Curated annotation (Swiss-Prot):
It catalyses: an alpha-L-fucosyl-(1->2)-beta-D-galactosyl derivative + UDP-N-acetyl-alpha-D-galactosamine = an N-acetyl-alpha-D-galactosaminyl-(1->3)-[alpha-L-fucosyl-(1->2)]-beta-D-galactosyl derivative + UDP + H(+); an alpha-L-fucosyl-(1->2)-beta-D-galactosyl derivative + UDP-alpha-D-galactose = an alpha-D-galactosyl-(1->3)-[alpha-L-fucosyl-(1->2)]-beta-D-galactosyl derivative + UDP + H(+). Coiled coil: none annotated. This is Histo-blood group ABO system transferase. The chain holds residues 64 to 354 of 354 of the full protein. GO terms for biological process: carbohydrate metabolic process; lipid glycosylation; protein glycosylation. Glycans are attached at residue 52. It comes from Homo sapiens (Human). Residues 3-292 are lumenal. The gene is ABO. GO terms for molecular function: antigen binding; fucosylgalactoside 3-alpha-galactosyltransferase activity; glycoprotein-fucosylgalactoside alpha-N-acetylgalactosaminyltransferase activity; manganese ion binding; nucleotide binding.
Length: 292
């Protein structure tokens, strides 16, 4: 049950004055695409606080990637769901390497020890299995689950505007691309296969989420698909991301996050269409960091 909002004073939405005219702000299945200027955060904060919303955030920091945790967590403290209940779940093979980060009130962190796989691809891919059925405390502890890469930092507001039954994020590399150019898995022998005449968007593996129920469905489905591929001796071109794209093609997200929510400034600069850079890639030497 949802109680009444209080009296609030804010600017009236004007029907004949769009918030943004430069970008698509709703998908053809009527899911909002979240861009700066499309939402009044004061209204959303009220709505979500009235439900006493708890948000779980998963992050994997395996082998050398433990090094990214300090900046990830300390910037999350500044920018992620501030004012709301947050539970961080840090999955790692090195619990003792998790930095001691000071948290704001109503926020907690749990360290979950997992095995490290040799291949960086396997580490990235096994996140689906680990999130799903494996971790069962989510249904009891949180309302929504957000699942992100660790090799990142928050620079601006990431808040309740993202919350919805199911969301994916537009990959910063491809938001302007036509579907034939998307790096979907193209081999029919893979469960992740998507033909050149199908596809809405190219979502990045580094930021997805939803209600606990929908996230468990997504991760379960992706894990089972990866298992079928493995039994068939095929590995999708972009690993977990290929399966995530297949899933979101066949199960449309109820919100889509703009690339404000996943950006690499070194690689892609700061285009006019991005009014804020919210959650951004931390430079890494891929080869060095992925191998002993
Ligand atoms: O040794 C490792 C390798 C990977 N990871 C975890 O796996 C995540 C994804 O790996 P990368 O960050 O190296 O992947 P990229 O950002 O380079 O590339 C993108 O493609 C991947 C598939 O190749 C994933 O889908 C990922 O979400 C997506 O952003 C990392 O953030 C980290 O959380 C580790 O913890 N340790
Ligand atoms: C066309 C130009 C491509 C621009 C970016 C490509 O990024 C890479 O895309 C892959 C799928 O095609 C996959 O998601 C990995 C992704 O690379 C990652 O994300 C980028 C934004 C960078 O941060 C990069 O270093 C990182 O490895
Ligand atoms: Mn990453």
């Amino acid at each position: 049950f949802m109680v009444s909002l209080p009296r609030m004073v804010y600017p009236q939405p004007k029907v004949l004055t769009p918030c943004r005219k430069d970008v698509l702000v709703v998908t053809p299945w009527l899911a909002p695409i979240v861009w700066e200027g499309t939402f009044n955060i004061d209204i959303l904060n009220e709505q979500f606080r009235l439900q006493n919303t708890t948000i779980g955030l998963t992050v994997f920091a395996i082998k050398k990637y433990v090094a990214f945790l300090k900046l990830f967590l300390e910037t999350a403290e500044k920018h992620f769901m501030v004012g709301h209940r947050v539970h961080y779940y840090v999955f790692t093979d090195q619990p003792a390497a998790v930095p001691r980060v000071t948290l704001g009130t109503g926020r907690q962190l749990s360290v979950l020890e997992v095995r490290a796989y040799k291949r960086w691809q396997d580490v990235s891919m096994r996140r689906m299995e680990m999130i799903s059925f494996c971790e069962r405390r989510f249904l009891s502890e949180v309302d929504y689950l957000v699942c992100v890469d660790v090799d990142m930092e928050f620079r601006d507001h990431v808040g309740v505007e993202i919350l919805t039954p199911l969301f994916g994020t537009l990959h910063p590399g491809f938001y302007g691309s036509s579907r034939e150019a998307f790096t979907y898995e193209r081999r029919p022998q893979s469960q992740a296969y998507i033909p050149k005449d199908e596809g809405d968007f190219y979502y990045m593996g580094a930021f997805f989420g939803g209600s606990v129920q929908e996230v468990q469905r997504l991760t379960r489905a992706c894990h089972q698909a990866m298992m079928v591929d493995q039994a068939n001796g095929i590995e999708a071109v972009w690993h977990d991301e290929s399966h995530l794209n297949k899933y979101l093609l066949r199960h449309k997200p109820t919100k889509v996050l703009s690339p404000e929510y996943l950006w690499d400034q070194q690689l892609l600069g700061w285009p006019a269409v991005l009014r804020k850079l919210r959650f951004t890639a931390v430079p890494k030497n891929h080869q060095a960091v992925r191998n002993p």
